Design a binder for this molecule. Structure first.
Ligand code: ADP
Lengths: 343, 343, 343
């Protein structure tokens, strides 16, 4: 009757995006964006959604569900695909929310980026940051480039994700992915060991934290490709905001190292298309022998002057004049209202 | 003799609004708005009201009762209903004050609002703030609209309350409520996870804090209905006061986003009626294609001009001329003495 | 079939720097800095790389691999040498990465370099850069020359390593080795103090960082032998790439200093031999009274013209025509395909 394994069964049979559990009702599934209860067999679930979720979570999580009130992880049913969970305490009762998790990475061209980006995958070392606010598909972007490298290069790529969003497959390069919580205790020692595990390209999952950044750099400056990601909105925001988490005693010193090992900043945002709702906008900065010196000498909005690689607003004008995004959706995601409408 | 469970017994038997404990007397109950001690059995309670309260509170509260001098939570006697507590140190001694939390939800019509409000519940996304000073029944209002959605729409509503005022019941939508203190550590991470728990409508319980607001927006502008609530008195106060908690570096940029994802502001206040004392007054602003542009260009009391959706004073004239509120109770709650009495 | 002992067998036979296991593929080995799967016998390894690594680790480690998600240790196969392991949890699965500890120091002749190199050890001061990609034995090279000086000269040598690869023994010279992490906080202050500790020969461990380079120079130009090492591939790459990490305000000024204190650049790579897999290829530039002026006046590929001390491709033709490396392994490691095959 009430076996998680079998509520997933009727979830992808009904062609589902999500499953949702709660105490007072029977198991629910989202189809299309409307929610229907498949009372079909699962009954109005007891207080013992407890037992159901508990059966998916490792020991490491069912501890963490007591410390805080929620956990965020990913498990696989070898039967179908892998999922992304989120168990949480509700009204003294347990409840979860399982998503579908992409099985194919998308090929790089369908993304809507130039090739001077794909070109970054050919570097020998440095930082490649892919910033952007949650649900801007930065993983989607990363996943692409990394895979491109997976096929193209004889490499040993290593990713320290939270959680593993895409599974990588087996080509020319050999790919270790380490989910946090599951397979390491923290981004901290997870990276720090990565640095000894003899890697080619390292993917520091998120750089929230001073110590992470620290080595993430120390790793890029030392023979490896370091793909980082963040939550800043523009290029010059990013490179402010990573230097802003240092003690300013030496703060300068990073700006310099950064203006040698910075190899690409790509801020992103996902928008509603005129068609099927799927279109991406971006700002793109790949440092050339010129831009380097600017950053060295702190002179930043002097780099904003020099962006024409390509500003954010600029990739909205080139997007709206082709009739893909509304004159009102893009005067919304755009940092500066001023730098367009003139266009 | 002195069992909490049994003091609640004689509390709803006597038909009570409140129970009150203190050290120097016996257990007290409010009936009607006068307080009588049911010395009936409970004796002049010792210093060990300690034991009585201690028996209701989770570990999480009896810690917090040491950090500060008080705690604010809610527990349930399945035997009758649920209650709202408030244990607090007094004169080196313990004391509490238990209310009855309600047991429906009122149907939206009994409230005294128009249906252009209830229409908000049909939006696809955005902010709907329901401001108003404590004991103006903003949870009451909320609870209504949310429940309206609970029945009408096939939805996954999530609320992050403090405390849970109304329990939601089980219809077309599936409803998680998360009491803070009890089920999460802070409005902060409680929301921040809600954003992952695949929600349709989110209810950020109060918007006191810069970081809360931040995501509350970021969630509205991204496909969800975000009900907020505050303590401001008029519409233009609200939309000043949320922008006023930002750093003005970018302050402008919120005003804009706000004039696209603002979908309704409803300030409220509760007044004494000529009959049973129960009548509500409100100010109502639902942005149309015109009002949008005003807020975009900072031009605010130009929206005050344009209010006739409907001003506060205005919903006092239409209230007193029908003979429900006194000429002196409403020149009291009204922001501006000027804009009436002329009427 | 799947015996660790025998995957090491085929690892040093093919002439390997590293072995790498993972779940979704067959055992991998790095040769030269490219990764190839010897599907030869070991099959697409199961989830039971578990069993393989488990067979190397003491009890003390297989405990620690549960506490954290990784462990870093060292075991010996008495059959060959000793290794450096790093087992770590990956995607719910085990994985490892074994390197190759020589703990001997090899006598300089077995290396396969001329004596005009060994002659550098007789200089009074300058930079001696030993560039080359990970697993090209640059420490092996270094260690040699340093030891040669250890026995030959009455000196105080000091190395700032990460980690200490070879232990130096006690002869005519007195040898301090400073492991980073263990015995100092950073290459930064570790060097910076080495400059006061009265040294004869200083070995700056890697030159990733603008400040390191700075002093590493300032030390060479002031009475000491400064052995540096990098990750560049050819000579002219090296001397671009260290000047490239300076601000170009003065950038010129290093090129000059460099064309006085540059004493030898030796780029390296390790290749699979026709016999036991152990053969090294190199490019060699020891500046004479002529080459100095060229670098002074920026004129670089004019030095490339003047290399015949000896080009990289050149040390592949003199290697393949003797029948030690394949016509296809060396048209792989070679920077330029053009400058050979004609030969
Ligand atoms: N029209 C009405 N019908 C029934 N109850 C009302 C009405 N107006 C006000 N009340 C009462 O006022 C009280 C305070 O409101 P409540 O929503 O609990 O607080 P808040 O102002 O903090 O949101 C409630 O107990 C509620 O029942």
């Amino acid at each position: 009757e009430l076996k998680i394994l079998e509520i997933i069964k009727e979830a992808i049979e009904l062609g589902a995006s999500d499953i949702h559990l709660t105490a007072g009702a029977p198991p629910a599934v989202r189809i299309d964006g409307y929610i229907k209860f498949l009372k079909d067999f699962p009954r109005l679930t007891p207080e013992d959604t407890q037992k159901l979720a508990y059966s998916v979570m490792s020991e490491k999580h069912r501890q963490k569900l007591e410390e805080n009130g929620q956990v965020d992880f990913s498990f696989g049913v070898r039967g179908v695909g892998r999922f992304r969970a989120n168990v949480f305490y509700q009204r003294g009762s347990v409840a979860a929310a399982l998503r579908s998790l992409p099985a194919e990475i998308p090929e790089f061209k369908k993304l809507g980026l130039p090739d001077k980006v794909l070109e970054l995958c050919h570097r020998k070392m440095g930082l490649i940051l892919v910033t952007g606010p949650t649900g801007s598909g930065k993983s989607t972007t990363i996943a692409s480039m990394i895979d491109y490298i997976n096929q193209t290069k004889s490499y040993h790529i290593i990713t320290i994700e939270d959680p593993i969003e895409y599974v990588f497959k087996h080509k020319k390069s050999i790919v270790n992915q380490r989910e946090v919580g599951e397979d390491t205790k923290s981004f901290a020692d997870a990276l720090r060991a990565a640095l000894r595990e003899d890697p080619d390209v390292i993917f520091v999952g998120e750089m929230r934290d001073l110590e992470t950044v620290e080595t993430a750099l120390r790793a890029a400056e030392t023979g490896h490709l370091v793909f980082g990601t963040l939550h800043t909105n523009t290029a010059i925001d990013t490179i402010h905001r990573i230097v802003d988490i240092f003690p300013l005693n030496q703060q300068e010193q990073v700006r310099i190292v950064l203006s040698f090992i910075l190899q690409g900043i790509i801020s992103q945002r996902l928008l509603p298309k005129i068609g099927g709702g799927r279109v991406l906008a971006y700002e793109l900065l790949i440092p050339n022998t010129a831009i380097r010196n600017l950053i060295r000498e702190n002179k930043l909005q002097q780099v904003y002057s020099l962006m024409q690689m390509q500003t954010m607003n600029q990739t909205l004008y080139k997007l709206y004049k082709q009739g893909l995004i509304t004159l009102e959706d893009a005067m919304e995601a755009s940092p500066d209202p001023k730098e367009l409408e003139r266009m």
